[PDB]
Symmetry: D2
Subunit: 93 residues, 4 copies
């Protein structure tokens, strides 16, 4: 079933607008998701590190990624395997 | 069309007192709710549909959960008092769990 | 429960509204809850019954199943397992499938 | 706007499936060729190529079962279901 591979698609909207799917490694830490998405788009290490990111399910209010889970070791797969197709990552440089 | 109803997966937790011990019971089931019902009344509608007394809702807490994310209060989902069930749940009903605790 | 005993199935029921004046091809779309452990080959009839249709029309109806916007296909194409349940076949996909039912 | 790409969970069968991004507005009848190129196969490989698409736990069905509309796009057919289907490509 989809997602059983190594990557998950995450829809990203980057403003500073540009909206686009990015493939992210499932086994990487969820708390690094914003940085990883931006690095995939060619943003510098320092630009990726300083961005503001909110995650949105469907039409719900976007929230900080820290609202999603308290576990420092949560992976992208842990949090997104079941919901990647309805989430939007809203990133502000 | 797309119908008048949307499915919502609900888990109702309530304590049942035996004699020498208590049980934290969990009853999980899908409920159909009207798309046009106000979202902030989801807890009341769910309980009614699951067969709970009207009075149980006035002693209930509820959190809504997407996938395996931390559950959050309904008020965290939207600031709009007039948001409907369809507004908030049409695109995500299959990944949400409504977790209700009866006191 | 843990997973519940019911599963939602989205149905679109087509029927001609008996009018002496003219033919109206009505489509009624609605979700219905059915037992997870019901046999998949019972789904059309039981979906109709659970939606409130009479036994007569639930018995003579013809069904197709549609993934997203794909061409609908007969239910026979879903599985060759004679004892497959509704849960077996639809647990993972009920939110993208439409049961297209044509009444007699 | 809504992105130009769509993820498709693809595998070329032999004897692991992975997501590939493909252009949404491209014809559905070009999907196999697009997926093949993204997976490291040549234009030539697409010539004889056939696809089976698997929905959840269902029997896989030939890609041809999906639509009889020559102008259907990848988005038309896959936007709503790319998270529950696997494209299996047969060379």
């Amino acid at each position: 079933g989809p997602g059983s591979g190594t990557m998950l698609p995450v829809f990203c909207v980057v403003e500073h607008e540009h909206a686009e799917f990015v493939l992210v490694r499932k086994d990487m830490l969820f708390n690094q998701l914003i940085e990883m998405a931006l690095l995939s788009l060619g943003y510098s290490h320092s630009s990726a590190a300083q961005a503001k990111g909110l995650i949105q399910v469907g039409k719900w209010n976007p929230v900080p990624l820290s609202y999603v889970t308290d576990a420092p070791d949560a992976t992208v797969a842990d949090m997104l395997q079941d919901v990647y197709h309805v989430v939007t990552l809203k990133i502000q440089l």
